[PDB]
Amino acid sequence: SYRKLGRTSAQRKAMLRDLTTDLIINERIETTETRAKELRSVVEKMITLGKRGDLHARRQAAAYIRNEVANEENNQDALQKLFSDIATRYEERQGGYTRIMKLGPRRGDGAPMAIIELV
Amino acid sequence: AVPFRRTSKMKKRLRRTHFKLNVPGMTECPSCGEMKLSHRVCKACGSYNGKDI
Amino acid sequence: QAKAVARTVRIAPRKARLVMDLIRGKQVGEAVSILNLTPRAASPIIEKVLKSAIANAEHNYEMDANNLVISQAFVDEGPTLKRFRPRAMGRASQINKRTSHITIVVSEK
Amino acid sequence: MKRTFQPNNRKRSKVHGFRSRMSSKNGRLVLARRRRKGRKVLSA
RNA sequence: GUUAAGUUAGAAAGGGCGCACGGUGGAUGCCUUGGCACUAGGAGCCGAUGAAGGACGGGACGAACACCGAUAUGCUUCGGG
RNA sequence: GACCGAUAGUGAACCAGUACCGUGAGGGAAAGGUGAAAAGCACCCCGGAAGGGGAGUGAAAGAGAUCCUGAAACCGUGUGC
RNA sequence: AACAGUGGUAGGAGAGCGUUCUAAGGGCUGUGAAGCCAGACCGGAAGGACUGGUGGAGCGCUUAGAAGUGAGAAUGCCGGUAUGAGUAGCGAAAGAGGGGUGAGAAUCCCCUCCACCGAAUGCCUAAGGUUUCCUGAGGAAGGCUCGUCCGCUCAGGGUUAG
RNA sequence: AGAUGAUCAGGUUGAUAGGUCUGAGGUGGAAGUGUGGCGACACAUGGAGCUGACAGAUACUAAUCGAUCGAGGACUUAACC
């Protein structure tokens, strides 16, 4: 199965897409846990595409991700960062490119927040 | 679709029995001691599973 | 023994009642842990007044902070504030912005 | 929806106004009533 | 000891009765700065020499009250104190 | 005054014909009490504050700014059965 | 003393209790009045004492008198507080993340992306409102939550015509 | 399995879920390159490429460290002893 997250198909795709880009950039983010659970899959998936490094994969990942900067002083974007840096990071690992450490809840929502990382 | 009678204190309390809060699933922070949720991060130690963020 | 009070704080009393029905009769340190870790609006208020209580004990009575216990702890419905919600059809509905007096008493073993 | 009160200060001051009330006998009697009661705002 | 049969306590998530202590709420009691009805006496009209009633303004100091009117939170000039 | 004593008595004991309602005429409230005297809580702590606990003033602080008393409904804490 | 009797609506009659005030006479009260709360007291009833506590200044008793003289109900009036019930609702519409501030952040500021309007959700301008404008402080109330924020509160300032 | 509780499978000598790799099934012949064609486009590369939940492996990630509750077993009688 898969979650809905209180959103429509389109705007959850947008959520997950933005979040993937944000995570690729920052290498760590705090969100809700459920959003993280749903990221984990697709994020490792894009990492598989990076490990492939083919142009077909480049165009797939471009179809997904957003056109943002990931490193100033380099004119680098999230996509280049993904392939180059992260595939060079994880040549050798087979899946499990993430960690999800649960945090406590939030003051306004009571929502269980959690951070997510690239390990 | 309305109360035919006013509810008495006794039944009001009998209803509000289960209306209560359980405590959390609590543990210490082995790093700097204080308490913590299970499977979750020590906000003050900033630590988890013997690892600092 | 020692006492602390938070008089006339805008919060409903039942909710505070829940939060202190948790801790009635417990050691202060674990009680603070409860209030820090439980997700409710009233726990900051209650740990605040409790912390004030133990401070009063240590400062005005010198009663060995670690060796303390909540002797009693309760809430009293204080002066409400009246408001009105404009419901449909020109009718209004009375609204009771409640208020509470929290009271905590701390002793030794 | 449209409602009864559509404010125009001109219409207010030319109907319910002081010149108007003083124009007519019965409008003077208002001011009499509207004083011995003690109303601060005796007219528009 | 076991087995069988039979008895009976005790429980309290919570609740009821009573008691104790508190809160809220504003009654009750006490009080009056205000009013009600009358008595005696006085006076019973004010205004174009601009009324009654108001608006706007005035203070060293913000608003409002009260007082006052560009002579503006008082000025002569007779008295009192 | 063999009249009222703050739900009474003027509608109005308090900045009321106010606030407020209404286009308008017009309608029309609520709301008194620290203490003999501010002597109105220096100072220490908790706390971001508020609000508390001490200390001090005071005959009294359980008198602390809805400030004499302060009932009942209602709200809770503990406990004997 | 004896004898007999003593259900009772409408309703008639008679006995009284209690409240406020007044007159007189006799009293109580800071060594603690009334009032309030308890109590296992007394009386045939209405009712009345006693003790203790609170309170902190006025009040009973007797005989008479006069009355705004006794409340459980009016879909009564006013006020307060409950129940329903932590229930319904939280008022159309895409937000996410990183930084920052701060005691405290889903909700405030900045940035980046994304999304909505686009004969309109954009620019002007009437009537009307009457300081809401700008800046800086604040977060008790209002904001259908929070709030470090504002069309809220304080201060100040700001509107220039042949 | 389920509104939530609950139930069930698992909790580091373990395949509970995700991810990864194999596949199934579904879609239908990817992008890029080249050839032909003025071009629209077609052919080959190549049952290709892609693929949510499906099943089989895989200790990569997360099921950590903890903590709490939970018995001491009444009496009488009858039989064995």
From Swiss-Prot, chain A:
Q: Give the record's GO biological process terms.
A: translation
Q: Which UniProt keywords apply?
A: Ribonucleoprotein, Ribosomal protein
Q: Say which domain of life the source belongs to.
A: Bacteria
Q: Which Pfam families match?
A: Ribosomal_L17 (PF01196)
Residues making up the signal peptide according to the UniProt record:
none
Does Ribonucleoprotein count among this protein's keywords? yes
Cellular component aspect of the GO annotation: cytosolic large ribosomal subunit
Task: Give a GO molecular function annotation for the protein.
Answer: structural constituent of ribosome
| Annotated SUPFAM superfamilies | Prokaryotic ribosomal protein L17 (SSF64263)
The similarity comment for this entry is: Belongs to the bacterial ribosomal protein bL17 family.
Which PANTHER family does the entry link to?
Answer: LARGE RIBOSOMAL SUBUNIT PROTEIN BL17M, RIBOSOMAL PROTEIN L17
Record note on quaternary structure = Part of the 50S ribosomal subunit. Contacts protein L32.
The molecule here is called: Large ribosomal subunit protein bL17
Please spell out the taxonomic lineage of the organism that makes this protein: Bacteria, Bacillati, Bacillota, Bacilli, Bacillales
From Swiss-Prot, chain B:
Q: Name one GO cellular component term.
A: large ribosomal subunit
Q: Which InterPro entries does the UniProt record give?
A: Ribosomal_bL32, Ribosomal_bL32_bact, Ribosomal_zn-bd
- Is Ribonucleoprotein given among the entry's keywords? yes
Is the Signal keyword given for this protein? no
Gene Ontology MF annotations: structural constituent of ribosome
Which of UniProt's keywords are assigned here?
Ribonucleoprotein, Ribosomal protein
Which biological process annotations from GO are given for this protein?
translation
Pfam annotation, one family: Ribosomal_L32p
Its family? Answer: Belongs to the bacterial ribosomal protein bL32 family.
Subunit and partners: Part of the 50S ribosomal subunit.
UniProt-listed HAMAP family: Ribosomal_bL32
Full protein name: Large ribosomal subunit protein bL32
Task: Give the gene that encodes this protein.
Answer: rpmF
Curated annotation (Swiss-Prot), chain C:
- The protein here is known as Large ribosomal subunit protein uL22
SUPFAM superfamilies, sorted: Ribosomal protein L22
Tagged with keyword Transcription regulation: no
**Superkingdom classification of source:** Bacteria
Briefly state the protein's biological role: This protein binds specifically to 23S rRNA; its binding is stimulated by other ribosomal proteins, e.g. L4, L17, and L20. It is important during the early stages of 50S assembly. It makes multiple contacts with different domains of the 23S rRNA in the assembled 50S subunit and ribosome.
Q: Determine if RNA-binding is one of this entry's keywords.
A: yes
- A GO MF term: rRNA binding
GO cellular component terms, semicolon-separated:
cytosolic large ribosomal subunit
Q: Which PROSITE patterns match?
A: RIBOSOMAL_L22
The record, for Pfam families, names: Ribosomal_L22
GO BP annotations, alphabetical order: translation
Annotated keywords: Ribonucleoprotein, Ribosomal protein, RNA-binding, rRNA-binding
User: What is stated as this protein's family in its record?
Assistant: Belongs to the universal ribosomal protein uL22 family.
| Quaternary structure and interacting proteins, as annotated | Part of the 50S ribosomal subunit.
From Swiss-Prot, chain D:
Q: What GO molecular function annotations does the UniProt record carry, in alphabetical order?
A: structural constituent of ribosome
Pfam families noted in UniProt = Ribosomal_L34
Instruction: List the InterPro entries hit by this protein, alphabetically.
Output: Ribosomal_bL34 (IPR000271), Ribosomal_bL34_CS (IPR020939)
Mind telling me which GO cellular component terms the entry cites? ribonucleoprotein complex; ribosome
Q: Extract the ranges annotated as region (Disordered).
A: 1-27
Q: Name one GO biological process term.
A: translation
Q: Which domain of life is it from?
A: Bacteria
Assigned keywords, A-Z: Ribonucleoprotein, Ribosomal protein
UniProt lists compositionally biased (Basic residues) regions at 1-19
| Assembly and oligomerization | Part of the 50S ribosomal subunit.
> Which family does the entry's similarity section mention?
Belongs to the bacterial ribosomal protein bL34 family.
Protein name in the entry: Large ribosomal subunit protein bL34
Q: Which gene encodes it?
A: rpmH
